[PDB]
Every structure is written in structure tokens, then in C-alpha cells.
Amino acid sequence: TMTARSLNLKGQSGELLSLSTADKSNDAIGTLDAALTRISKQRANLGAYFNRL
Amino acid sequence: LTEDQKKKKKEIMEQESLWKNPDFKGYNKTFQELHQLSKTFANNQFRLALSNYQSGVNTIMKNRDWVEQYRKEEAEKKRLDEKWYWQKVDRKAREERVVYREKMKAKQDALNYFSKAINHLDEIKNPDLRERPEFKRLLSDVYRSWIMAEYDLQNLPQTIPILELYIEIDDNEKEYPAHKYLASAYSFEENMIKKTKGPDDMLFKYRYKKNVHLLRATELKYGKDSPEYKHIVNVIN
Amino acid sequence: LTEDQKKKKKEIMEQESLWKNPDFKGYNKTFQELHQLSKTFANNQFRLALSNYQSGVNTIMKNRDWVEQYRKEEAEKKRLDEKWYWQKVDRKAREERVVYREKMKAKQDALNYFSKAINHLDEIKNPDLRERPEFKRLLSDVYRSWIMAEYDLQNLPQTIPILELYIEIDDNEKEYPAHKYLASAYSFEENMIKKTKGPDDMLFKYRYKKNVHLLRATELKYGKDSPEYKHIVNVIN
């Protein structure tokens, strides 16, 4: 894992001091479900593995 | 008309067609020719560059289809709480928001593909191959679509380095639309300096470059020492 | 083409074939010729050297069969605890490790056999026999397989003394692959000095030897004062 584990959206429409913006709002928050899901389930296997040990 | 005036009229119309907003007949023609050129070229990195360019254009074409469908679906909704003028204008502006944000994402995906097409062309290191008409045709098509994708979303400052790279390739400098877009994008940047009260060196830099490409576009379409050429020169002098 | 350019094209293809990764048709051809040469030579130590060389190549060939079978058996397993990306990448990487460790052992057994083939050729003391085409053919085949066994496992520094001994034998110095491998192995060693921040004398030694064999490989395949020869010389000068 690294920030590129999910769609790593930065910034938002309008004037910024960066050179990046977020994508279609619908996916942006939807992505955070993916981010949370992807990491939690990775912990899930580690959890399960601990039980195996 | 003279043979040069007839030739010029024909060429300007072909150049305006060349920069035509994408559609299905132009897509078909473009990719049929590019694939025949790829088979002639027989270069795996050119093949890959074309595969990515085509994926980028497909992103653009699929988006154009989405925009019509989205606007259609909204038009067909019954809106019961839309009885006041501000309510109708409200919902219109929010439709434009979603369309603009989706077009912005389609542009970003299309430019990631165009960037990959360029990165693959960069891997053709042999100078005898980089000078091939096949190489220059594809590279010109990638830059042209890239310029247009940004232009449509009013990202005019971003079009300048790509237009400049474009005109350096195989007599593209003699294309009237290329100089028209450069002049317009430079004009935008000049106006940005005037609105944001930026430095004079940049005001004059952008004004100068606007006038160079304004005059060159004029020369190319109407001819040197034409009433139109003489006019633009007299305004600048 | 000239008679020399036609001859050169033919020879480079034969040399590329000579250094082809081993397979069953090449194995059969190689050992049928070596056994006929052994019968002509009528030297018990050459016979023994060939028996060991063949045992070494057989180790390599039997390993190649093992690697296909092993990967096949793994591919055919149902993997229930492989539902995350890193689980698949894990099990793939460990498969590759087991294959690499088994290939490493096969290389070690094959080189023990090649070493024995050399130790038996060392026992041919008569200079009139050591100069026999039969002697030089087998010795070249042992060094070539030895170089390739190490090359495949990225043991490039180890290939240098064997490539150097190889090129000293019966015009092997005129072989394009021999100089390509030397140049690549020297390049690796140069990079090792740059990465480990080693002494300058070794940096330049390895860089020099890379360039000598790079240029010589170029000369051999394309010809002296060819666009390609001139290019490499101009980069070095």
C-alpha cells in the first residue's frame, strides 16, 4: 500500500495553489469507500493470518 | 484567380477540415489511414503509440456520446419544484456543472493516453525513423487532438507549448488554424496579465506573440500584401 | 551487396544460431557432430571430456523440462486463499524463487561437469593434439555452454574470464555474440562500481573494456567505416 491504493484525488474545482483537482464528485467519495474497503480487507487477511499462526 | 490563389483557397478549406471538431466520419478516416501507415512503418513503438492515441480519441468520442445522453435524460424529467425563473436557471447551471466536470475527467484520461502515445514515440531513437512521414503524421495527430481537448474546455495557456511543438513539425507552421489558435491563446494570456495586474515584460511578451501569429495567420489565408495583410501590418506598425 | 557483405550477413546469422538458447534439435546436431569428431580424434581424454560436457548439457536440458513441469503443476492448483492482489503476487514470486534456486543448482551441477570436461582436456599435453580442430571445437562448446549457463542467471562478472578464454580460440574473436556478451558483462561491472562507489581505476577499466568490445561487435556485424561503426567511434573519441 501507498497513496496509490485508491484513486488518490487531490485539490478541487476552482482556483488553487496546486496543479491538481479532484474528479467527478460521484466517484470521489465512492473511491473513499474503495480506499477504506481495500485497506480494511487487507487488515482482515492479516487478522485471519494471526489466527492461523 | 491565379494558380497560387486557387491552391491557397483549397488548402485553407482542407486545413479548417483538418482541425474540425471530432465526429464519426473523421474518426473512421483518421484511424483507417493511421493503421495503414503503422503497417508500412512496421515499428512496435509506433504501433503502441497509435494504440494509445486511439484509446485517447475513443475517450473523447465516448464522452461526446455521454453528454448527449445525459442532457437527454435530464430533458425528459418532470420537475415539479421548478415553477420559478431562478429554479429553472439553477437546475440548468447544475446540469452544466456535471457535464463540464465529466468532460474535464474525459480530457484528463484522454491526455494521459496522449502522453503515453508521445512516451512511446520518444522511444523511437533512430533519427532516420523519427524523420519518417509516418512518425510525423502520428505525432501531429496526437498534438492536434491534445490541443483541441484543452481548447474546448478553455484551457488556452496549456495549448501554447503543444501548438508550438506542433508548428515545428513537417510544414505545420503553414497551417492557418495553428496560428489562429496560438494568437487566441496568447491573447487570453495578455488579458490575464491585464486583469491580474501582472508584470509589463509578460504583457508585452504575450501581446508580441499574439501579433506575430495574428499577422502570420492573415498572411497564410489572404496572402502577403493583400488588403487584409496590409491592414494588420499597419495596425501593428 | 558485395561478396564480403553477403558473407558477413550469412555469418552473423550462423553466429546468432551458434549462441541460440539450447533446445532438442541443437542438442542432437551438436552431440552427433562431437561424437563423430571424437571417433576421428581417437583420444581417451577427449572422449572423457565429451562424456562430461554432454552430462553437463543434459543437466541443463533436464532442468528446462523440470521448470515447464513445475510451473504447469502450480498453474493447475486451486488457490482458495488468493483472493487479494498481494496474495497472487506473493505466490507468483515464491514460485519464481523455487524455480531460480533449482536452476541455480542445475547450473552448479552443469558447471562441475564442464569443469571436469576442461580438466580432462588439460590432460592432453601434446601440443600437436591441442592444436587439433576436434580439441578446439569441444573446448569452445564447453566454454560457450558455461558462459550461457551463468548468463541466464545474471551471473555476468563470472562470464568474463570464460568469454576471454573463448575468444582466444580458433578465430572465435571474430564472433559478434562473443563481443556483445563481453561488452554487456563489462557494462554490468562498470555499473556495480558506480552503484557501490568503488575505485575510479576499476570504473575506467570496465568502461574501457565495454567500449572496446562494443566497437568490435559493431565492426564485425556492420563493417569498418559503416554509418554504425563511425557513430560508436565518434561517441568514444
PDB file of all heavy atoms in Angstrom, chain C residues 20-74, unseen atoms left out:
ATOM      1  N   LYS C  20      22.379 -19.719 -29.800  1.00  0.00           N
ATOM      2  CA  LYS C  20      20.939 -19.924 -29.515  1.00  0.00           C
ATOM      3  C   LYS C  20      20.752 -20.674 -28.234  1.00  0.00           C
ATOM      4  O   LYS C  20      21.462 -21.647 -27.985  1.00  0.00           O
ATOM      5  N   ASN C  21      19.767 -20.253 -27.429  1.00  0.00           N
ATOM      6  CA  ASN C  21      19.442 -20.977 -26.206  1.00  0.00           C
ATOM      7  C   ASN C  21      19.250 -22.459 -26.531  1.00  0.00           C
ATOM      8  O   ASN C  21      18.724 -22.771 -27.598  1.00  0.00           O
ATOM      9  N   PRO C  22      19.717 -23.390 -25.680  1.00  0.00           N
ATOM     10  CA  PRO C  22      19.643 -24.816 -26.063  1.00  0.00           C
ATOM     11  C   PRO C  22      18.220 -25.338 -26.214  1.00  0.00           C
ATOM     12  O   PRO C  22      17.304 -24.881 -25.530  1.00  0.00           O
ATOM     13  N   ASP C  23      18.051 -26.271 -27.159  1.00  0.00           N
ATOM     14  CA  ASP C  23      16.806 -26.985 -27.445  1.00  0.00           C
ATOM     15  C   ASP C  23      17.185 -28.364 -27.959  1.00  0.00           C
ATOM     16  O   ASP C  23      18.375 -28.672 -28.068  1.00  0.00           O
ATOM     17  N   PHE C  24      16.189 -29.182 -28.298  1.00  0.00           N
ATOM     18  CA  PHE C  24      16.446 -30.580 -28.653  1.00  0.00           C
ATOM     19  C   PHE C  24      17.093 -30.781 -30.027  1.00  0.00           C
ATOM     20  O   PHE C  24      17.890 -31.707 -30.177  1.00  0.00           O
ATOM     21  N   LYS C  25      16.728 -29.950 -31.033  1.00  0.00           N
ATOM     22  CA  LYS C  25      17.332 -30.038 -32.366  1.00  0.00           C
ATOM     23  C   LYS C  25      18.822 -29.625 -32.347  1.00  0.00           C
ATOM     24  O   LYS C  25      19.638 -30.275 -32.999  1.00  0.00           O
ATOM     25  N   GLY C  26      19.145 -28.551 -31.629  1.00  0.00           N
ATOM     26  CA  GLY C  26      20.531 -28.118 -31.448  1.00  0.00           C
ATOM     27  C   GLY C  26      21.339 -29.118 -30.644  1.00  0.00           C
ATOM     28  O   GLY C  26      22.474 -29.437 -31.013  1.00  0.00           O
ATOM     29  N   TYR C  27      20.739 -29.674 -29.569  1.00  0.00           N
ATOM     30  CA  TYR C  27      21.390 -30.713 -28.770  1.00  0.00           C
ATOM     31  C   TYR C  27      21.778 -31.895 -29.673  1.00  0.00           C
ATOM     32  O   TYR C  27      22.929 -32.368 -29.646  1.00  0.00           O
ATOM     33  N   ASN C  28      20.793 -32.420 -30.427  1.00  0.00           N
ATOM     34  CA  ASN C  28      21.009 -33.573 -31.302  1.00  0.00           C
ATOM     35  C   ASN C  28      22.137 -33.297 -32.302  1.00  0.00           C
ATOM     36  O   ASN C  28      23.073 -34.076 -32.366  1.00  0.00           O
ATOM     37  N   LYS C  29      22.048 -32.180 -33.042  1.00  0.00           N
ATOM     38  CA  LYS C  29      23.072 -31.793 -34.017  1.00  0.00           C
ATOM     39  C   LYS C  29      24.458 -31.709 -33.376  1.00  0.00           C
ATOM     40  O   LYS C  29      25.413 -32.313 -33.882  1.00  0.00           O
ATOM     41  N   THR C  30      24.560 -30.989 -32.251  1.00  0.00           N
ATOM     42  CA  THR C  30      25.820 -30.774 -31.522  1.00  0.00           C
ATOM     43  C   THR C  30      26.472 -32.112 -31.126  1.00  0.00           C
ATOM     44  O   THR C  30      27.668 -32.302 -31.357  1.00  0.00           O
ATOM     45  N   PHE C  31      25.711 -32.993 -30.482  1.00  0.00           N
ATOM     46  CA  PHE C  31      26.334 -34.219 -29.995  1.00  0.00           C
ATOM     47  C   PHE C  31      26.590 -35.233 -31.098  1.00  0.00           C
ATOM     48  O   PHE C  31      27.624 -35.903 -31.042  1.00  0.00           O
ATOM     49  N   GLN C  32      25.768 -35.259 -32.166  1.00  0.00           N
ATOM     50  CA  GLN C  32      26.080 -36.148 -33.295  1.00  0.00           C
ATOM     51  C   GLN C  32      27.448 -35.739 -33.900  1.00  0.00           C
ATOM     52  O   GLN C  32      28.278 -36.593 -34.155  1.00  0.00           O
ATOM     53  N   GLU C  33      27.705 -34.428 -34.067  1.00  0.00           N
ATOM     54  CA  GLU C  33      28.975 -33.945 -34.629  1.00  0.00           C
ATOM     55  C   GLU C  33      30.155 -34.188 -33.677  1.00  0.00           C
ATOM     56  O   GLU C  33      31.224 -34.634 -34.108  1.00  0.00           O
ATOM     57  N   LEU C  34      29.954 -33.925 -32.384  1.00  0.00           N
ATOM     58  CA  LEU C  34      31.008 -34.135 -31.392  1.00  0.00           C
ATOM     59  C   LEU C  34      31.426 -35.579 -31.275  1.00  0.00           C
ATOM     60  O   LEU C  34      32.626 -35.849 -31.140  1.00  0.00           O
ATOM     61  N   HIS C  35      30.451 -36.522 -31.339  1.00  0.00           N
ATOM     62  CA  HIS C  35      30.793 -37.941 -31.303  1.00  0.00           C
ATOM     63  C   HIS C  35      31.537 -38.367 -32.583  1.00  0.00           C
ATOM     64  O   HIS C  35      32.492 -39.137 -32.490  1.00  0.00           O
ATOM     65  N   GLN C  36      31.149 -37.847 -33.768  1.00  0.00           N
ATOM     66  CA  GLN C  36      31.912 -38.183 -34.968  1.00  0.00           C
ATOM     67  C   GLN C  36      33.352 -37.648 -34.845  1.00  0.00           C
ATOM     68  O   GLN C  36      34.299 -38.361 -35.187  1.00  0.00           O
ATOM     69  N   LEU C  37      33.514 -36.429 -34.278  1.00  0.00           N
ATOM     70  CA  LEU C  37      34.837 -35.816 -34.093  1.00  0.00           C
ATOM     71  C   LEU C  37      35.651 -36.616 -33.093  1.00  0.00           C
ATOM     72  O   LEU C  37      36.842 -36.825 -33.319  1.00  0.00           O
ATOM     73  N   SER C  38      34.995 -37.137 -32.039  1.00  0.00           N
ATOM     74  CA  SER C  38      35.653 -37.963 -31.028  1.00  0.00           C
ATOM     75  C   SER C  38      36.243 -39.234 -31.679  1.00  0.00           C
ATOM     76  O   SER C  38      37.399 -39.583 -31.405  1.00  0.00           O
ATOM     77  N   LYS C  39      35.461 -39.900 -32.548  1.00  0.00           N
ATOM     78  CA  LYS C  39      35.901 -41.102 -33.284  1.00  0.00           C
ATOM     79  C   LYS C  39      37.075 -40.769 -34.175  1.00  0.00           C
ATOM     80  O   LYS C  39      38.020 -41.567 -34.238  1.00  0.00           O
ATOM     81  N   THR C  40      37.055 -39.578 -34.823  1.00  0.00           N
ATOM     82  CA  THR C  40      38.206 -39.140 -35.628  1.00  0.00           C
ATOM     83  C   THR C  40      39.397 -38.855 -34.770  1.00  0.00           C
ATOM     84  O   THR C  40      40.509 -39.237 -35.133  1.00  0.00           O
ATOM     85  N   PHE C  41      39.170 -38.213 -33.613  1.00  0.00           N
ATOM     86  CA  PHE C  41      40.262 -37.833 -32.746  1.00  0.00           C
ATOM     87  C   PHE C  41      40.946 -39.060 -32.122  1.00  0.00           C
ATOM     88  O   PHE C  41      42.175 -39.110 -32.124  1.00  0.00           O
ATOM     89  N   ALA C  42      40.170 -40.069 -31.658  1.00  0.00           N
ATOM     90  CA  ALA C  42      40.712 -41.319 -31.082  1.00  0.00           C
ATOM     91  C   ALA C  42      41.655 -40.991 -29.879  1.00  0.00           C
ATOM     92  O   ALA C  42      42.813 -41.394 -29.828  1.00  0.00           O
ATOM     93  N   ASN C  43      41.151 -40.184 -28.949  1.00  0.00           N
ATOM     94  CA  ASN C  43      41.905 -39.766 -27.776  1.00  0.00           C
ATOM     95  C   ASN C  43      41.023 -40.013 -26.540  1.00  0.00           C
ATOM     96  O   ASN C  43      39.969 -39.408 -26.411  1.00  0.00           O
ATOM     97  N   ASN C  44      41.450 -40.896 -25.636  1.00  0.00           N
ATOM     98  CA  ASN C  44      40.593 -41.237 -24.488  1.00  0.00           C
ATOM     99  C   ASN C  44      40.224 -40.036 -23.597  1.00  0.00           C
ATOM    100  O   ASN C  44      39.074 -39.933 -23.153  1.00  0.00           O
ATOM    101  N   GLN C  45      41.148 -39.081 -23.416  1.00  0.00           N
ATOM    102  CA  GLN C  45      40.856 -37.912 -22.581  1.00  0.00           C
ATOM    103  C   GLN C  45      39.843 -36.960 -23.247  1.00  0.00           C
ATOM    104  O   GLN C  45      38.999 -36.412 -22.553  1.00  0.00           O
ATOM    105  N   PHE C  46      39.883 -36.820 -24.573  1.00  0.00           N
ATOM    106  CA  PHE C  46      38.880 -36.086 -25.351  1.00  0.00           C
ATOM    107  C   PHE C  46      37.529 -36.802 -25.199  1.00  0.00           C
ATOM    108  O   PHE C  46      36.532 -36.143 -24.936  1.00  0.00           O
ATOM    109  N   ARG C  47      37.499 -38.154 -25.368  1.00  0.00           N
ATOM    110  CA  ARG C  47      36.266 -38.930 -25.172  1.00  0.00           C
ATOM    111  C   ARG C  47      35.673 -38.623 -23.794  1.00  0.00           C
ATOM    112  O   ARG C  47      34.472 -38.356 -23.689  1.00  0.00           O
ATOM    113  N   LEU C  48      36.501 -38.676 -22.729  1.00  0.00           N
ATOM    114  CA  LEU C  48      36.058 -38.376 -21.351  1.00  0.00           C
ATOM    115  C   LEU C  48      35.608 -36.944 -21.190  1.00  0.00           C
ATOM    116  O   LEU C  48      34.594 -36.679 -20.526  1.00  0.00           O
ATOM    117  N   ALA C  49      36.324 -36.018 -21.818  1.00  0.00           N
ATOM    118  CA  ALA C  49      35.952 -34.608 -21.752  1.00  0.00           C
ATOM    119  C   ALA C  49      34.545 -34.432 -22.370  1.00  0.00           C
ATOM    120  O   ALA C  49      33.737 -33.657 -21.847  1.00  0.00           O
ATOM    121  N   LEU C  50      34.285 -35.119 -23.501  1.00  0.00           N
ATOM    122  CA  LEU C  50      32.982 -35.057 -24.181  1.00  0.00           C
ATOM    123  C   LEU C  50      31.869 -35.703 -23.348  1.00  0.00           C
ATOM    124  O   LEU C  50      30.765 -35.144 -23.243  1.00  0.00           O
ATOM    125  N   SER C  51      32.164 -36.837 -22.721  1.00  0.00           N
ATOM    126  CA  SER C  51      31.209 -37.525 -21.859  1.00  0.00           C
ATOM    127  C   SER C  51      30.760 -36.596 -20.736  1.00  0.00           C
ATOM    128  O   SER C  51      29.553 -36.524 -20.444  1.00  0.00           O
ATOM    129  N   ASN C  52      31.715 -35.832 -20.142  1.00  0.00           N
ATOM    130  CA  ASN C  52      31.367 -34.876 -19.071  1.00  0.00           C
ATOM    131  C   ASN C  52      30.628 -33.661 -19.594  1.00  0.00           C
ATOM    132  O   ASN C  52      29.672 -33.195 -18.959  1.00  0.00           O
ATOM    133  N   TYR C  53      31.100 -33.098 -20.727  1.00  0.00           N
ATOM    134  CA  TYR C  53      30.401 -31.953 -21.331  1.00  0.00           C
ATOM    135  C   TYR C  53      28.939 -32.342 -21.601  1.00  0.00           C
ATOM    136  O   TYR C  53      28.018 -31.610 -21.206  1.00  0.00           O
ATOM    137  N   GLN C  54      28.724 -33.499 -22.251  1.00  0.00           N
ATOM    138  CA  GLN C  54      27.369 -33.958 -22.566  1.00  0.00           C
ATOM    139  C   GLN C  54      26.507 -34.117 -21.305  1.00  0.00           C
ATOM    140  O   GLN C  54      25.331 -33.755 -21.333  1.00  0.00           O
ATOM    141  N   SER C  55      27.095 -34.656 -20.209  1.00  0.00           N
ATOM    142  CA  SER C  55      26.407 -34.778 -18.905  1.00  0.00           C
ATOM    143  C   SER C  55      25.987 -33.391 -18.373  1.00  0.00           C
ATOM    144  O   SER C  55      24.885 -33.259 -17.820  1.00  0.00           O
ATOM    145  N   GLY C  56      26.873 -32.386 -18.507  1.00  0.00           N
ATOM    146  CA  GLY C  56      26.560 -31.006 -18.135  1.00  0.00           C
ATOM    147  C   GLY C  56      25.398 -30.441 -18.937  1.00  0.00           C
ATOM    148  O   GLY C  56      24.474 -29.847 -18.374  1.00  0.00           O
ATOM    149  N   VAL C  57      25.424 -30.628 -20.269  1.00  0.00           N
ATOM    150  CA  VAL C  57      24.333 -30.107 -21.126  1.00  0.00           C
ATOM    151  C   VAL C  57      23.019 -30.842 -20.776  1.00  0.00           C
ATOM    152  O   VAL C  57      21.966 -30.211 -20.683  1.00  0.00           O
ATOM    153  N   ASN C  58      23.100 -32.160 -20.555  1.00  0.00           N
ATOM    154  CA  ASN C  58      21.941 -32.959 -20.137  1.00  0.00           C
ATOM    155  C   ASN C  58      21.348 -32.402 -18.851  1.00  0.00           C
ATOM    156  O   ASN C  58      20.123 -32.347 -18.756  1.00  0.00           O
ATOM    157  N   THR C  59      22.197 -31.973 -17.876  1.00  0.00           N
ATOM    158  CA  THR C  59      21.707 -31.336 -16.632  1.00  0.00           C
ATOM    159  C   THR C  59      20.864 -30.115 -16.973  1.00  0.00           C
ATOM    160  O   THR C  59      19.773 -29.923 -16.420  1.00  0.00           O
ATOM    161  N   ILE C  60      21.365 -29.288 -17.889  1.00  0.00           N
ATOM    162  CA  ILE C  60      20.668 -28.072 -18.328  1.00  0.00           C
ATOM    163  C   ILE C  60      19.330 -28.408 -18.994  1.00  0.00           C
ATOM    164  O   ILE C  60      18.297 -27.800 -18.644  1.00  0.00           O
ATOM    165  N   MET C  61      19.345 -29.368 -19.943  1.00  0.00           N
ATOM    166  CA  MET C  61      18.150 -29.794 -20.692  1.00  0.00           C
ATOM    167  C   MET C  61      17.086 -30.413 -19.762  1.00  0.00           C
ATOM    168  O   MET C  61      15.898 -30.123 -19.912  1.00  0.00           O
ATOM    169  N   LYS C  62      17.515 -31.255 -18.814  1.00  0.00           N
ATOM    170  CA  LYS C  62      16.604 -31.879 -17.852  1.00  0.00           C
ATOM    171  C   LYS C  62      15.970 -30.807 -16.935  1.00  0.00           C
ATOM    172  O   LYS C  62      14.786 -30.892 -16.594  1.00  0.00           O
ATOM    173  N   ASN C  63      16.761 -29.814 -16.527  1.00  0.00           N
ATOM    174  CA  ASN C  63      16.262 -28.668 -15.768  1.00  0.00           C
ATOM    175  C   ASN C  63      15.185 -27.896 -16.556  1.00  0.00           C
ATOM    176  O   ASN C  63      14.137 -27.586 -15.984  1.00  0.00           O
ATOM    177  N   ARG C  64      15.436 -27.580 -17.845  1.00  0.00           N
ATOM    178  CA  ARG C  64      14.467 -26.837 -18.672  1.00  0.00           C
ATOM    179  C   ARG C  64      13.115 -27.615 -18.642  1.00  0.00           C
ATOM    180  O   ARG C  64      12.047 -27.018 -18.447  1.00  0.00           O
ATOM    181  N   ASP C  65      13.172 -28.967 -18.771  1.00  0.00           N
ATOM    182  CA  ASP C  65      11.958 -29.790 -18.709  1.00  0.00           C
ATOM    183  C   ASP C  65      11.294 -29.681 -17.338  1.00  0.00           C
ATOM    184  O   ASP C  65      10.072 -29.647 -17.281  1.00  0.00           O
ATOM    185  N   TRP C  66      12.085 -29.677 -16.248  1.00  0.00           N
ATOM    186  CA  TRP C  66      11.582 -29.548 -14.868  1.00  0.00           C
ATOM    187  C   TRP C  66      10.822 -28.228 -14.674  1.00  0.00           C
ATOM    188  O   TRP C  66       9.748 -28.221 -14.056  1.00  0.00           O
ATOM    189  N   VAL C  67      11.403 -27.118 -15.156  1.00  0.00           N
ATOM    190  CA  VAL C  67      10.844 -25.766 -14.991  1.00  0.00           C
ATOM    191  C   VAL C  67       9.445 -25.682 -15.618  1.00  0.00           C
ATOM    192  O   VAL C  67       8.524 -25.192 -14.945  1.00  0.00           O
ATOM    193  N   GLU C  68       9.265 -26.201 -16.868  1.00  0.00           N
ATOM    194  CA  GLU C  68       7.942 -26.273 -17.510  1.00  0.00           C
ATOM    195  C   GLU C  68       6.993 -27.124 -16.682  1.00  0.00           C
ATOM    196  O   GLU C  68       5.882 -26.685 -16.409  1.00  0.00           O
ATOM    197  N   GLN C  69       7.424 -28.323 -16.265  1.00  0.00           N
ATOM    198  CA  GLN C  69       6.555 -29.198 -15.470  1.00  0.00           C
ATOM    199  C   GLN C  69       6.146 -28.542 -14.144  1.00  0.00           C
ATOM    200  O   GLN C  69       4.965 -28.564 -13.801  1.00  0.00           O
ATOM    201  N   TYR C  70       7.115 -27.939 -13.415  1.00  0.00           N
ATOM    202  CA  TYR C  70       6.839 -27.282 -12.132  1.00  0.00           C
ATOM    203  C   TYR C  70       5.803 -26.163 -12.267  1.00  0.00           C
ATOM    204  O   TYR C  70       4.828 -26.124 -11.488  1.00  0.00           O
ATOM    205  N   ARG C  71       6.009 -25.259 -13.238  1.00  0.00           N
ATOM    206  CA  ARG C  71       5.114 -24.129 -13.470  1.00  0.00           C
ATOM    207  C   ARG C  71       3.709 -24.632 -13.835  1.00  0.00           C
ATOM    208  O   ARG C  71       2.719 -24.110 -13.322  1.00  0.00           O
ATOM    209  N   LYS C  72       3.638 -25.710 -14.651  1.00  0.00           N
ATOM    210  CA  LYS C  72       2.396 -26.384 -15.057  1.00  0.00           C
ATOM    211  C   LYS C  72       1.644 -26.872 -13.819  1.00  0.00           C
ATOM    212  O   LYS C  72       0.454 -26.544 -13.658  1.00  0.00           O
ATOM    213  N   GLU C  73       2.332 -27.620 -12.933  1.00  0.00           N
ATOM    214  CA  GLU C  73       1.721 -28.210 -11.735  1.00  0.00           C
ATOM    215  C   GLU C  73       1.158 -27.127 -10.810  1.00  0.00           C
ATOM    216  O   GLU C  73       0.073 -27.304 -10.245  1.00  0.00           O
ATOM    217  N   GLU C  74       1.883 -25.995 -10.679  1.00  0.00           N
ATOM    218  CA  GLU C  74       1.418 -24.854  -9.892  1.00  0.00           C
ATOM    219  C   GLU C  74       0.217 -24.164 -10.497  1.00  0.00           C
ATOM    220  O   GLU C  74      -0.726 -23.834  -9.771  1.00  0.00           O
TER     221      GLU C  74
END
